[PDB]
Amino acid sequence: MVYSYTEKKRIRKDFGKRPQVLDVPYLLSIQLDSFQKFIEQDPEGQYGLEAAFRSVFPIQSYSGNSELQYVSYRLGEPVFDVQECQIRGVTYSAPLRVKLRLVIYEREAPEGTVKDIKEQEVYMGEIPLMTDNGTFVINGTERVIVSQLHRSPGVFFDSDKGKTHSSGKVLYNARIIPYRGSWLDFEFDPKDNLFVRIDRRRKLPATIILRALNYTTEQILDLFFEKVIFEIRDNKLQMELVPERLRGETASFDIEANGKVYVEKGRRITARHIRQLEKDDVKLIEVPVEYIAGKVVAKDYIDESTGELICAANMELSLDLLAKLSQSGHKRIETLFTNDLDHGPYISETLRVDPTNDRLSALVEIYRMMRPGEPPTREAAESLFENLFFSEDRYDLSAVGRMKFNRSLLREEIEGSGILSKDDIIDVMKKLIDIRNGKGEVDDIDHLGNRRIRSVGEMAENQFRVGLVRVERAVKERLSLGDLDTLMPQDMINAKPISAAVKEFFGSSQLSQFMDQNNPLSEITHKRRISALGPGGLTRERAGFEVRDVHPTHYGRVCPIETPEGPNIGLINSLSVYAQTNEYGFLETPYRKVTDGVVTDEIHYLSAIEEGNYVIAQANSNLDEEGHFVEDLVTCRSKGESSLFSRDQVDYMDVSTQQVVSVGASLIPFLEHDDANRALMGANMQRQAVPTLRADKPLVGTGMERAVAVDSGVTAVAKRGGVVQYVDASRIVIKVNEDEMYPGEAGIDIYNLTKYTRSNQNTCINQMPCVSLGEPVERGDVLADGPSTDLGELALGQNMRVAFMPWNGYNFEDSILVSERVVQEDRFTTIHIQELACVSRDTKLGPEEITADIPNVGEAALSKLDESGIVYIGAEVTGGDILVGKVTPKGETQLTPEEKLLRAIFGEKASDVKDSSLRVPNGVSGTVIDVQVFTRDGVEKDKRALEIEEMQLKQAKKDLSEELQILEAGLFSRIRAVLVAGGVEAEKLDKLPRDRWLELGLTDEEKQNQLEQLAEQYDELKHEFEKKLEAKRRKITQGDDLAPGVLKIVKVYLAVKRRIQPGDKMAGRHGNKGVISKINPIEDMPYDENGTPVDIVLNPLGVPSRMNIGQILETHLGMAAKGIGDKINAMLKQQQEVAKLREFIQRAYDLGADVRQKVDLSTFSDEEVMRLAENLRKGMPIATPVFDGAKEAEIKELLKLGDLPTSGQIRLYDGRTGEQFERPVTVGYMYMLKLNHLVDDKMHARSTGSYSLVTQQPLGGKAQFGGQRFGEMEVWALEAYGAAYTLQEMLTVKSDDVNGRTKMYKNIVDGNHQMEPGMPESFNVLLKEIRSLGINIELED
Amino acid sequence: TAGTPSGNGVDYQDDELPVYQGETTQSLQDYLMWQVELTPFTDTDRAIATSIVDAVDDTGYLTIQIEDIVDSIGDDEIGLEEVEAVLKRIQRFDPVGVAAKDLRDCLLIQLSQFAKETPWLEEARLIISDHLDLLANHDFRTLMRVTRLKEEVLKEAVNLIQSLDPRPGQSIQTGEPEYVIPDVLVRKVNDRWVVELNSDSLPRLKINQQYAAMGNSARNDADGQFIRSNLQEARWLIKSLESANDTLLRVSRCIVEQQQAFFEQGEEYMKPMVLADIAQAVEMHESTISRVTTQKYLHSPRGIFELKYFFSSHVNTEGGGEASSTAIRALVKKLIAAENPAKPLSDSKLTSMLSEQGIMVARRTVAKYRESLSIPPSNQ
Amino acid sequence: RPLVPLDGGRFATSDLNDLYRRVINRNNRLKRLLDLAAPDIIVRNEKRMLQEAVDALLDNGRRGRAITGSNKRPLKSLADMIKGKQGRFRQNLLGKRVDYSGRSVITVGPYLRLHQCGLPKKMALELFKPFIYGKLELRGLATTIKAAKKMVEREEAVVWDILDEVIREHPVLLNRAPTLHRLGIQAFEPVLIEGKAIQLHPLVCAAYNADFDGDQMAVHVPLTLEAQLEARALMMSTNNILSPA
DNA sequence: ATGTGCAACAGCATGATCGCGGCAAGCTGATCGTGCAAAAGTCGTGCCAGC
RNA sequence: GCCGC
């Protein structure tokens, strides 16, 4: 109840100090949920394949009265499972079956149909599926897909830092970004002119687009400005009063209110005068005529006498114009505001710049600017403008785009048309003018509320949509030439482009890369990875200093610690433990609701925008029993800041202290005691560890090991756990209990563990059981632990006894000193697996045969080859041994006498057939593990192929017959009970087979009903098992459909053990790394007064400068834990009774200062206590959470419990001199990992090899036997030394002097040591290159 | 595809402007020159060594005569005595026995490099190698009497001789058997033996040509429109490739139509189809069809991988109508192999058997068919 | 300008070959169309085509927004692939790769002198192969070069003895990849050690800016009397003790 | 008092942006038909020399 | 491209 079966075997001592509200999520929910939403059926057309089909289908020809109606779709069962798919090297995918019908409409009768062919489902392409762990097995690989962090479609306003024209003038711009389509932009000139940049083309005034929307000059001036009315009647020339707008202005003359002076000429302009004027109800008042001189007419007043009128908008007025309008009777004149206090002159200047005022003129102008080719004919311009924006299939903002668009402009409605209208462009322009005016502010583009996440499902949906559009384009053509005989497969189903697009996206993309397979931690980290790069992302060199900086919005969403170092720092991030993605695609993080002064248990997920308003408390703020805050003033985040608030002003609380760290950074104990960058290095280095031979749990952990181990999927977890029936190194069979059971056919659970298997990084993957026999298990318990996992806990390192002291300079700088005892116990010894393959491929001259006998090959070479030419399993091959014996034919149809006598003396071939055999590459050694020969259909079966097929059939029958045995035993038990009910012969009945001829008939009812039904069920069971067995046999024995050219394939695996050595690299999980300097003998290492030497010696000089106190704290804590473990081991050694041992374990499990763990041994069974105590001989595995855990006092009392000094330092004696070191030395246990950088892959040397055809210089890199590159800086250094002869021998003799190389080699062999230089080939190549142009360059004498 | 191979070894030169650059390979002649450059030779000796190693074939034997080498030198005091010494020095290089004039010399030099105490050194040094080599080619029943030695000793001397390398210098080759078969013409078995074509890449080429040429033309960055600058080159290329694939498919369909029986039941059922037979079928001239189907290759479950192997005009004056000499040769090979241990296989007897079977062929032709790819089993 | 080989006998033309082929095609078509007395419009178009092909061959990426092809990547013209970054960076002007060069991870040796470094014997016996061949042929252990080569291949004990004899006073020079000043490359006297890691004297780490947490070095052999004297009398670690800045 | 010459400002195109090393991954193709003489090449057939 | 210095 309190603890599960897998946890009662070994309980970590949690230091706690704070309860946990909600548990850590599945840690893999993003990829799983995204692909589930992409794949699963949806009754509505919301998302996925159904959404794409509804987007394109239904489709009809151009008035051809023929349409294809789409109804539902399905995915067929995969033809291979995951394991055999990986072992074969093929893609794991499912066929796509789509059901659609052809309808033929009546030509004579409108809206009538004549035919309706409802043909069955058809096939187009195969959609790859993801495994249970979120991986896409394509081409026999893993190929995880990385999520992308991009800018959400919508509207963004920016100020470009206001430094472009060097005048200090800040420039505002607005951008409209759709999900798919062409961008739109607005910009501000330094002369304050509205300019647009459509599709990033040359800048044009906004007035062309503004007029293209059927907007006249009067209407634009009316909508974009607040027009005022000027009344000139009986020469009074009054003005309407708008005191609200009249804020800043100078009175040109005396201002009187209803004939009484209100404001004098040039009087006070303060708010008091405005308030006094507004208080008095005053009608229109007269003004001096000089004020109207600067005014501009807005409307276009018409003269009632003659058709002539002053329609010149955006123009001032003249003194004669006043008389002209008075003659026409214009009593009221409409003029815009023309006030510059907060508003200003806009839009009008752009209309003055551009004189086009017609929709046709604007359309042709934008057609010329967009397309500088052929001028339009009133149809090209209209159609092109309709295609640019406001087109259903050309321009499209997603629902998130519409949401952001409406929210940024303060519109209540969220949902809306997915295509932009006429009004929103006007609203955007008005908003930009508003920001320029002063009201409003620019938004942050690095704000996490403006950045979205694209997962695998959405990208796959987009690729499928593109492919289906391409298919549709071809489909539309055929319908014009369609008769009634055509069906759906004959209607251009076109699987080719669907499959091509989908496979191109999955197999070859920037965001679909090989997944890391070192540890489960690297797989977990890679799966939940956020990347800013990609197709639609931001490139490395385009990234400024601000996009790769941590933001105050990164709190509970992305980790500020985990990130790559050099190129991609800040561009690749990792999700936090509790972070999850909103419905629209924005990051979220949970918080606890706070009501009054008590924090509640209900949990709300807040995004980046919502959390910006509330006041959020801290996770590590103390609370009372009732939930109230124990102190009045608490620390909170209000708006991107930190300050103290009252106990009542808070609104939310953090769920836990791990909210801001990712999975990788959660496994670092004492993270708060490490420097940020060194902890970054430690977190990045924890993922490069190599799983060892034997797993070893960490003594000082965190408690996240169980979650990482279970959620990664390397282990084997029970799903309907009952009791364990049969155990083996390769199988576990569990008898599911009766309480939960599927009715009928009984049922058992069979788990086939994956033995030694090559991973992506050429490491080893192996699973071994954890249950012994007859041991009851529950659902979710761990049965087998995969690579680097001990009893269901992440264990990717080993517990090393460490002394912090300088030792004769052998730990100088970052080096590490290691004892020989560490080497002897095979710690840090890893298994590496390699795959080698050879293919027999047909040729014109004849087929390629794989045979044991190899011409011109001695008998010693054929010793390790079988009768079929394939190595025996288990043979140890080194150097250049032959693996597969393959012969290539040669062509000769002219039998000359010498070849005739050659054939006479020797075999019929006379060794004409060349040999091309798969040999081990030099420097590679190991034991042959597996051979996986594949053959084509029709070709003769290989001799070993029969043996492998036999073993596969044996395994299938062995794992299939268990359920048959169970079912037949149940049937026999039922028959025995029936015969016991009547006419029981007991042992006499049990002795004869077939229930002693079904116990005759006995009673009529039993014979007619019981015995007959039992016999019928028995026969049906036999027939069912038999058909299933021959189905398995047929599936096993088949000819693999190979490539048209290939004929046979053989794959060979080699496994080798890599031991530790001075060249190897070793590092802890606190950012402290190094290389081994020496493997010291046991008697030379320092020892304490008990004679036990240390295993590792490190330098104290590396602690203070790097600022890692977690190192020392973990060392002390590991020493305390191992002291308690030693006490338990010693007390178990002396055969002490169970009572005292239980008392000691209970005392050790109740330590700490009010921890939240309540483990008690009172309810523990005695055998359970014995097993748990036997599991703590090697140490007590205590756990400290990330930002709360053990303190100095608790560590010291833990030390005092185990009879160890509280200072953490003991007296060491020199193993060489026998003298005691003058000062005490810090000794303890530190968890040390083994990184993937070994000198067996980093040691290289070359004297002579191969050179390129061009420039004749040595090749580069290992596996090609290349030479080290002597770059430009090395030559600069040689020049600065004055070494001219060394430089000359570097440039000519060693690299490019073709004759010089041979001459110098001949001199060296003879012993001359003479140079004889020449002309490098590269200069000749350069001369030929320059001469290949029209330029002549020559070497004059 | 149930089983798919892992990607074959391939690479391309990166971070280097002349992409793919190259990679030097070491051949037999290059290795011989490298060995020559590291031994003390005079200038005349060096010239002779270069001249004689230039003539080394792929198998490691000298193709040109020694007197012809002397004539090639064309200088006095370089008579055959000197070139003989130089060649004999050259022979003892890393592929021991390389640059050998004949088989006898190769065995002599191979046996020379030994402990001089092997059980049958003098037995096969000259009695077997330098003499009665033709006898050793046959059963060598009279060789024991000729050499005055017991047959038991010869039974081990023959094995000792066979222990030597027959063709030294062929273990140095660095070429890779990458001359695999594209099989651009794929074929599967159906109710009518349908024939398809793979590796067309026509949709891919069309898409790439579009996205490049029409992509630049549709792009509005350049002034005007590239309606013919780039758009009207991809169309020409696509049309040419489509026409080529169409005529190839038509020729293949004609070939399978006239040669259905070769693929059905027995393999040796080819009609003697001529170029005019397909020319009239496809209404195209014979020259184009001959140039089209002269190295194109098909992928058949049982038939040969070629498109010219079927094109035979070998009527051979068959009794009933006409026949193909390919089937006649196949039948002769099958019958000759399946015969008595004596295996007479006489040309007259084979011709009589073929005539009885219905193939009216002269006794002199059958000798040519047999000698093309076989030898008479003691028919003389 | 070699053309790339593919699987089978197929050959794929490189970018320069494509440019030359296009220029030749345009020239041939223009020549054949000139003699037909065609209207001047198509003559004008074909002359423009030939000119554009010539500019694309000589200088890609200008006047026509590049030609690209088959991967939506610009084709490499004659000037773009002159030498590395259009200059002389990669395979000329001090960019050469060299023979007699090695590389491995460095560790610390506190027992060393200022002029000594620890050289693995597997890294040796490969850099000093021709010297070992010469010493074997000179001492009479092997007469032919083939015998000496085979004996070195079999790595017998006398081979190790001769290697130790031939390394005696031959200085070797180690450099670290970011060579910032002239002290980033120095000449030491090799000492044969068993293993795979180079043992560097701690006192030169500051000059090298080297630490033992995973760095690597490169080893070059000065195989000439003049080069040996220069490495001993100029670039020895005992020679440079004061920084030249 | 109006017209002409010269210096300055804004816009546009061009060139460059540290090394060294190890996994990796895709292949970058082809082309065209012509219908005919003119040539070279090839096959069914009969010959003499060796056993 | 990923990683190491």
Ligand SMILES: [Mg+2]
């Ligand atoms: Mg370092």
